Each structure stands twice: as C-alpha cells, then as structure tokens.
Amino acid sequence: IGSLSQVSGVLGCQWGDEGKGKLVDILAQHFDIVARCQGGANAGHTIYNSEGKKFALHLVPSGILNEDTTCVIGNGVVVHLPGLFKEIDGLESNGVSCKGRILVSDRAHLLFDFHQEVDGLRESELAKSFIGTTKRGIGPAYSSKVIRNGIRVGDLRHMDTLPQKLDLLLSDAAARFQGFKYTPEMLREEVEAYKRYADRLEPYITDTVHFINDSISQKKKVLVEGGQATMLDIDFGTYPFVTSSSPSAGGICTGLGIAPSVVGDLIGVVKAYTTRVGSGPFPTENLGTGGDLLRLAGQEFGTTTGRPRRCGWLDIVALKFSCQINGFASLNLTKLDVLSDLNEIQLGVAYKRSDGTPVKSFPGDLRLLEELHVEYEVLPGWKSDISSVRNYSDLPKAAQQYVERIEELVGVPIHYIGIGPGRDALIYK
Amino acid sequence: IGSLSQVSGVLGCQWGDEGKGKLVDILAQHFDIVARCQGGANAGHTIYNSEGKKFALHLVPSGILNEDTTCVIGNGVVVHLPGLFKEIDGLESNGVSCKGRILVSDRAHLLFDFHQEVDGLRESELAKSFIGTTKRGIGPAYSSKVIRNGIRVGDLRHMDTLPQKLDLLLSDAAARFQGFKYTPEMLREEVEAYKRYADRLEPYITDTVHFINDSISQKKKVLVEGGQATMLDIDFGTYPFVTSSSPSAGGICTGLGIAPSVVGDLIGVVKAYTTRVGSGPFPTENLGTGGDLLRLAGQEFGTTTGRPRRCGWLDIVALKFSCQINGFASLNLTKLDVLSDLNEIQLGVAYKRSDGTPVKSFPGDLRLLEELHVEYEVLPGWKSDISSVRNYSDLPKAAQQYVERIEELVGVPIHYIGIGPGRDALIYK
Numbered sequence: 129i130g131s132l133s134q135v136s137g138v139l140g141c142q143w144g145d146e147g148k149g150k151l152v153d154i155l156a157q158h159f160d161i162v163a164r165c166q167g168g169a170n171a172g173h174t175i176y177n178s179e180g181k182k183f184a185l186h187l188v189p190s191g192i193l194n195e196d197t198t199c200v201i202g203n204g205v206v207v208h209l210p211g212l213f214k215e216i217d218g219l220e221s222n223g224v225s226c227k228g229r230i231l232v233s234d235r236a237h238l239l240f241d242f243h244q245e246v247d248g249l250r251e252s253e254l255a256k257s258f259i260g261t262t263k264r265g266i267g268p269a270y271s272s273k274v275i276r277n278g279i280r281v282g283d284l285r286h287m288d289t290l291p292q293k294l295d296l297l298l299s300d301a302a303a304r305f306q307g308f309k310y311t312p313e314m315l316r317e318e319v320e321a322y323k324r325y326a327d328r329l330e331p332y333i334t335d336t337v338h339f340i341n342d343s344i345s346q347k348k349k350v351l352v353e354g355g356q357a358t359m360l361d362i363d364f365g366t367y368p369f370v371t372s373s374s375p376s377a378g379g380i381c382t383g384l385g386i387a388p389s390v391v392g393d394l395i396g397v398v399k400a401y402t403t404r405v406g407s408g409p410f411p412t413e414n415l416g417t418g419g420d421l422l423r424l425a426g427q428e429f430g431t432t433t434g435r436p437r438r439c440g441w442l443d444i445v446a447l448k449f450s451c452q453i454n455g456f457a458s459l460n461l462t463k464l465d466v467l468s469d470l471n472e473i474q475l476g477v478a479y480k481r482s483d484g485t486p487v488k489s490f491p492g493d494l495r496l497l498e499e500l501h502v503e504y505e506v507l508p509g510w511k512s513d514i515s516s517v518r519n520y521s522d523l524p525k526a527a528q529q530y531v532e533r534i535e536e537l538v539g540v541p542i543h544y545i546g547i548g549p550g551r552d553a554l555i556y557k
Numbered sequence: 558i559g560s561l562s563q564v565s566g567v568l569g570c571q572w573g574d575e576g577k578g579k580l581v582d583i584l585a586q587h588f589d590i591v592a593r594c595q596g597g598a599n600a601g602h603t604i605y606n607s608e609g610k611k612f613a614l615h616l617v618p619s620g621i622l623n624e625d626t627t628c629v630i631g632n633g634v635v636v637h638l639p640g641l642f643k644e645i646d647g648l649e650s651n652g653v654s655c656k657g658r659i660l661v662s663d664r665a666h667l668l669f670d671f672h673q674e675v676d677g678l679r680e681s682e683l684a685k686s687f688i689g690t691t692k693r694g695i696g697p698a699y700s701s702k703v704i705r706n707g708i709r710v711g712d713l714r715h716m717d718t719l720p721q722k723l724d725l726l727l728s729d730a731a732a733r734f735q736g737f738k739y740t741p742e743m744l745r746e747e748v749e750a751y752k753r754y755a756d757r758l759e760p761y762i763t764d765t766v767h768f769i770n771d772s773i774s775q776k777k778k779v780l781v782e783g784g785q786a787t788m789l790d791i792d793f794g795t796y797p798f799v800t801s802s803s804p805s806a807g808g809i810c811t812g813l814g815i816a817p818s819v820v821g822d823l824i825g826v827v828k829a830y831t832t833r834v835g836s837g838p839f840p841t842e843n844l845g846t847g848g849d850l851l852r853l854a855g856q857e858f859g860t861t862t863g864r865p866r867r868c869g870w871l872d873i874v875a876l877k878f879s880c881q882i883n884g885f886a887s888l889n890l891t892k893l894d895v896l897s898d899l900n901e902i903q904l905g906v907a908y909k910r911s912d913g914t915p916v917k918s919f920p921g922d923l924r925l926l927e928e929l930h931v932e933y934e935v936l937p938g939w940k941s942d943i944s945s946v947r948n949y950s951d952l953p954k955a956a957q958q959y960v961e962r963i964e965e966l967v968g969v970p971i972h973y974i975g976i977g978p979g980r981d982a983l984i985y986k
C-alpha cells in the first residue's frame with residue numbers, strides 16, 4: 129500500500145459500480161492529494177468511516193474523509209454548482225470540514241440547470257435504446273464543451289459577460305427543443321443565482337493544472353480517482369451505451385493536465401462478478417437464480433430508485449480488454465464475499481461467433497456483442513462466511529484459487545481483495 | 558534518432574503549424590507504424606519528398622510517404638469519407654500506393670456532409686466574435702459523439718440500420734437549425750452514397766485498438782502523430798479559441814487505446830517563434846514590423862486562403878506550460894532559419910498583470926490573457942544564411958545560444974532543429 133507510486137490512480141474495469149470509493153478512502157490515508165478527472169455528479173461513491181456512517185459522495189473526491197488530504201476537482205469534470213454546494217453543505221453538517229480542502233478547477237465546465245432539462249427532453253424521443261441516465265445532463269454538458277460555447281468555472285469571475293454566454297447556451301437549447309420553456313425572465317433568474325454561486329465558489333476556484341504539476345514536482349503524493357468504469361468509456365466502451373466522459377487512464381491526463389509519463393501505477397477495481405445499470409450489451413448477464421442472487425447478496429439496486437441492476441459473471445474477455453486499455457499495475461477484486469453462498473462459480477473465459485469462429489478481443493460492434501456467446505469455466509465455490517477474514521492465507525482454498533485464477537487469465541496481479549462494505553474489510557495481497 | 562522509444566509520439570506546442578508533418582515524415586524511416594489519434598481533416602501537414610514534390614496530407618498520417626510503413630487512423634479521429642478517398646485518390650496518382658497501408662479504425666466517428674453545413678450555420682448566426690474555421694464541421698462531429706447519437710465507421714457494416722441512424726442525426730440537425738434544408742430525398746441521397754463508401758472502405762476498416770496493442774507486444778515501432786498543438790486543446794488551450802479534440806499527450810491514449818505507461822518519448826515541435834491562424838489570446842503577438850518580417854521569412858499565409866497569419870516571439874510561458882502538460886522528452890525547434898535576418902531576437906519570458914502581480918503559469922481565463930503584458934528578453938541574432946548547415950557546431954554562435962537558451966528556460970533538451978522546409982533540412986543534436 130505504501131509502495132504505490134507518487135502519482136497513483138484508481139479506475140473501474142466493468143460497467144460502473146465496482147467499488148472504487150471504498151478503495152480511494154482506504155488509500156487516501158497515505159496520499160497528500162486526491163483528484164477526480166472526468167465525469168460529473170452522475171457518480172455515487174459510497175463509503176463508511178471508522179464508526180459506520182454512510183457517506184455517498186458525488187462530486188467531492190472520496191478522499192474527503194481524510195482531514196489531512198486536499199481534494200481536487202479537475203478540468204475534465206463537469207460541475208453542477210447547485211448540487212456541489214448541496215453536497216458540501218450536508219458534508220460539513222455531518223462532520224467533515226470542507227473549508228480550503230476542495231479545489232475546483234477554473235478550466236472545468238459548468239453543468240447548468242438547463243443542461244438537465246435538455247437531456248431529458250431527448251429521452252422522450254429515444255426508441256427502445258434509451259439511456260439509463262435519469263435527466264442528469266452529462267451528455268449536453270460535454271456537448272457544449274466540444275461545441276466551444278459552454279461556460280467554464282473561471283468564467284464566473286466576469287459577471288459582466290456571463291449573462292451574454294448564458295443567452296447563447298439557452299438560445300441553442302430553445303432553438304433545438306420546442307418543449308424547452310425559455311423566457312427572458314428565466315435568463316435573469318440563473319444570472320442572479322449563479323452570481324451568488326460565483327461569490328461562494330470563489331475561494332474554491334484554483335488553477336488545477338498548475339497546482340497538480342507544482343505539487344508533483346514538490347514530491348506530493350497524488351491519487352487520481354476514476355470517475356466510472358472503462359466499459360462505459362465514450363471510446364472504448366459499448367457505444368452508444370456509455371457515458372460522455374473518459375473513465376479510461378487517458379482521462380487522467382486530459383482531465384488533470386498530467387503527462388502520460390507522470391502517471392504512475394493504476395489499480396483496476398474489478399468486482400468479483402459483473403453488473404450494468406442501464407440497457408445495452410452484457411455478454412455474461414444472468415437472468416435467473418444466480419442473477420437474482422448476486423443482486424441480493426451484493427445489494428445491486430439503485431440507491432435513489434431501487435431499480436434492480438443487471439448481474440452476471442466476471443467477464444474475463446472484457447476484463448483483459450480494460451487491462452490493456454489502461455495498463456493496470458494491480459487489481460482490486462471487490463465483492464468477493466458476495467460469492468460466499470455460491471455452490472459453483474462461473475467465469476466468462478471466451479467469446480465465439482454464431483458460426484463458431486472465436487472472437488479475438490472485446491469487439492466494438494454492438495451487434496456482434498449481442499450475437500456471440502460466452503464460454504464459461506466453472507470453479508468450485510467455498511460456502512463459508514468470510515467477511516471477517518483479514519489475512520490472505522486465512523481465506524478458504526476455493527476462494528484463493530478463484531483470485532489466483534483471475535490473475536492467471538488476466539496477467540495482472542491482485543493486491544487488494546474486498547470482502548465487505550466496511551472500511552476495514554480489505555485483504556491485502 | 559534510432560534511440561527513440563518503442564512508442565514515440567510527436568505533438569505541437571504552440572497554436573498549430575509548428576512543422577510536425579516534416580518531422581514525422583523524417584522519423585518514419587525507423588518506425589513500423591505511424592498513427593493519427595485525434596482531430597479531423599482540419600489538418601494540413603506539408604511535406605517534401607527526396608525530389609521536392611509538395612505533398613499536403615490531411616487525414617492520412619504523414620508517414621504515408623515511407624513505403625514500408627503502415628498508417629493507422631485511430632478511434633479518436635473524425636473521418637469524413639468523401640475527403641479521405643479524394644485524398645487517397647490524389648495520393649496514389651502521385652505515386653504512393655495506399656493499398657493495405659491505411660488502417661481505418663472501426664471505432665472512429667464519421668464526419669458527415671451535414672456536419673459541415675451545420676457548423677457553418679452557427680458562425681453566420683453568431684454576432685461579433687467568430688471562430689475563424691473553414692467550416693469543416695469538427696465541432697459538430699464530436700458533438701454527436703458526446704451525445705452518443707453519432708455514427709461510427711463500424712456501423713457501415715450494417716447497412717440495414719444505417720439509414721435509421723442517419724434520420725436521427727439529420728433530424729437533430731433540422732430541428733436545431735431552420736436554415737438546414739432537410740428533405741426525405743437528401744436522406745436517401747447520403748444512404749446510397751455512403752453505401753458505396755462502405756463497400757470501398759471495407760478493406761481499410763480494422764480494429765485499431767487491437768492492432769496497435771498487439772503490434773506493440775510484438776515489438777513493432779509506433780510513432781503517434783499529433784493532430785495540432787496543445788494551445789488548441791479543448792481543455793488546456795485558450796478556450797473557446799481551440800479545437801474540439803485533445804492535441805495533448807492524453808489524446809494519444811484516448812484516441813488509440815494506449816495505456817499511459819505504454820507511451821514512450823514525446824517530441825514537442827516548437828517553432829523558433831509563434832503563430833496563430835484564427836483570432837483569440839496571443840500574448841506575444843507583434844503588430845509591428847517585427848511581426849511583418851517574421852511572417853515573410855516564414856511564409857505564414859493560409860495555403861487555401863492566402864490569409865496573413867498572426868506572428869510573434871517564441872512564448873516561453875506558453876511553452877513551459879505545454880511542456881509540463883505533455884511531459885516532453887525532447888523538442889524540435891522548427892523554422893530557426895526564419896530568424897536569420899533578425900538583428901535581435903526576443904523571447905516572451907514572463908507574464909505580469911496590469912497591477913504588476915506576476916501571472917504564475919499560463920492562465921485559463923481568456924480575459925486575464927488579454928489584459929496581462931509580457932516581459933521580453935533580447936538575444937543577439939546571427940545575420941547569415943543557415944539553410945545549408947548540416948552539423949550543429951557549424952551553426953553561428955548566436956544561433957546555438959538561442960537554441961541553448963530555450964533549453965535553459967524550459968528544461969527540455971532540443972534534439973531536432975529545423976532550418977528549412979526540406980526533408981533533409983534538419984540538424985540533429
């Protein structure tokens with residue numbers, strides 16, 4: 129743990145809910161800075177302190193629980209101020225003092241209220257391939273960024289031109305969707321509202337790129353927190369069933385201003401099995417007993433909705449893919465304890481076409497991904513409670529073998545084994 | 558030169574026309590693969606072969622002149638098929654055989670004809686300050702990618718659904734801009750057109766991610782080609798006066814599927830001074846005779862338009878910035894020969910606010926970037942022709958000192974010095 133590189137990172141290997149939050153929180157004990165690089169409020173990093181208090185971070189980096197840690201919100205992120213403050217409010221009321229510990233990049237883009245209303249207006253137009261995003265507005269935010277008419281955090285320091293920028297964004301949104309209720313009164317609404325936010329955010333705004341780099345040359349330890357998993361990447365994911373950001377290792381560079389040569393060891397958080405929140409390709413998805421079971425044992429339900437999340441077996445093909453894309457040094461096999469009630473465990477060892485020809489690497493073509501079939505391997509499951517095991521060799525032999533099997537197949541070793549939602553529930557290897 | 562890492566790369570440090578094309582063409586001799594990772598057709602890499610023929614690449618990687626080199630168009634790119642073929646056509650008629658040498662990623666997005674018409678509709682609609690783009694539609698291309706409704710290269714293998722995707726994109730475009738002439742006839746137009754493109758492009762389409770990665774473990778040499786310069790990066794540039802892609806080192810990872818730990822030595826192409834094609838923040842801009850002379854000796858005029866480009870002194874503040882963002886190993890100081898007529902050469906050494914407070918690092922705030930003033934340094938120029946100098950020590954002492962000074966202020970060594978547009982006009986150090 130203390131042998132990690134000066135600039136380490138934590139990324140997701142599957143489809144989003146691996147359990148990075150827990151890891152970052154545990155790792156932040158030996159890191160000066162914890163910085164998020166991509167995504168937005170769409171997250172939901174759940175952590176439990178030393179006592180057992182349930183903290184569900186969204187924008188604020190998971191390392192916010194460590195008092196001697198400076199949290200940085202990078203440039204690749206899309207901050208929604210109303211929500212950011214609300215998160216800070218309820219964070220300080222629960223103990224953690226966020227004063228001068230949350231550095232918000234001035235190059236990061238502002239996700240506005242209209243961005244959220246606009247995202248949803250497009251959902252009622254989608255066919256059977258609708259996204260799972262409940263009007264969050266991540267797409268529209270990055271849309272504006274790329275178009276180059278979006279507003280950034282540093283733009284809040286020029287309240288004179290802010291209403292001018294606002295008009296355009298709102299004009300674009302009104303011209304597009306007829307359902308968008310746009311009035312000259314609503315323009316003045318967010319202008320006054322964001323003015324208060326601008327005054328409030330002021331102390332927070334800082335040059336992230338400069339800070340990170342300066343800190344790095346100052347020998348300060350930096351732990352980058354992966355927004356989501358790579359299979360949700362805008363490029364390497366299961367397009368179009370992905371997020372608009374870059375959960376990949378590249379997003380650390382583009383989202384923080386760090387050179388590739390500066391990025392150190394990356395730990396890929398892999399769940400003992402797999403899950404997927406929205407719709408789309410899922411090769412190892414189980415729609416029966418084992419599926420309903422993994423969901424209950426892992427409590428794989430929406431936190432805000434309670435909607436059942438798709439469950440399946442650890443996809444080895446999809447995992448080797450994420451391993452090469454990010455070049456992970458180590459892996460964090462989470463939710464191992466979920467497999468404690470399994471008689472026999474399965475692994476998605478290979479892909480093969482309808483016709484029989486083996487599939488090379490994880491394909492980008494959604495169709496081929498929904499046509500092919502998986503070749504499983506069955507490992508003997510241990511049937512004993514393990515949420516109390518602290519050492520490695522104390523683990524049931526069947527469990528050890530499962531871990532060791534994933535390593536043999538993937539090539540990347542596992543140094544972290546999660547066996548419970550607890551902060552202390554982690555087996556080092 | 559042969560000491561370069563297995564996976565090298567060449568990126569731009571200023572605002573676009575540094576001279577990478579020349580360099581990649583020169584470096585391609587010792588590389589098995591040359592791959593573009595970001596941007597689109599907006600490029601204009603000019604190169605001269607052994608004889609003196611002027612080749613102006615756009616989409617095809619600059620290493621296309623080397624017969625034993627397989628060019629790869631990564632996934633971060635936005636290919637406009639009509640233009641790509643037109644380029645391949647006029648390329649093969651000029652000698653170079655592109656058969657089985659241009660590998661087009663299946664995960665790359667397709668820049669459509671409507672994307673170009675749409676892009677131009679937003680500039681004429683806007684009042685006052687524009688962008689200065691030739692209406693190539695790079696922005697809208699990435700817009701759709703982010704929105705996740707954009708069509709990719711691999712989607713051409715499913716002609717049955719292709720017309721469905723088209724309708725959405727065109728619907729989005731028509732709903733937004735009233736000026737967009739959309740008819741059910743123009744839909745079928747591009748459908749039949751792109752069917753032909755699909756059949757023709759078929760041989761080219763390959764899994765870029767897999768190819769690159771597999772090739773790399775096979776010990777094949779890969780030279781990544783930087784689209785443009787980092788000061789034009791969507792994040793680290795001078796927003797909103799930047800491109801929609803990531804010309805940064807990160808773009809190599811997100812645009813190719815290469816892990817940061819895999820990316821080797823990056824070479825930063827720096828002009829002996831600075832230029833800027835469009836409008837926007839340009840600290841070192843010289844509106845006097847100094848810029849006039851600088852422009853003429855450098856031939857800084859649009860190739861397609863003939864428009865005069867903004868000229869200035871080598872910005873050290875902007876250069877150190879790009880150097881930390883990409884973490885360059887070496888630099889390629891280009892167009893040195895342009896300063897051969899200069900009595901004295903200046904360097905933008907520091908930034909200072911209106912009140913006097915020093916501006917730490919390169920700022921993101923465009924306003925601050927247009928308010929601050931630059932503190933220059935004046936070095937004695939050599940007044941001799943050097944376009945024929947082959948060895949380093951053969952260069953006038955004043956020239957050597959200029960080179961060594963840039964290395965002292967920046968911290969990154971210069972191993973390549975350009976003294977002419979020629980293929981052979983490069984001094985190694």
Ligand SMILES: Nc1nc2c(ncn2[C@@H]2O[C@H](COP(=O)(O)OP(=O)(O)O)[C@@H](O)[C@H]2O)c(=O)[nH]1
Binds near residue numbers: 146149174176545549
């Ligand atoms: N049962 C169990 N829960 C775990 C384990 N590791 C983490 N968790 C919990 O699983 C949930 C996954 O974390 P979440 O915040 O949703 O994932 P994130 O996407 O990385 O933010 C959290 O409630 C964790 O405390 C484990 O080994 N077993």
Ligand SMILES: Nc1nc2c(ncn2[C@@H]2O[C@H](COP(=O)(O)OP(=O)(O)O)[C@@H](O)[C@H]2O)c(=O)[nH]1
Binds near residue numbers: 576892977
């Ligand atoms: N005088 C002079 N011209 C150069 C030198 N290096 C490159 N050039 C010219 O300027 C161009 C530089 O940018 P260009 O190729 O248009 O695109 P890039 O890919 O952004 O470099 C070259 O193609 C040459 O014609 C140099 O050392 N001296």
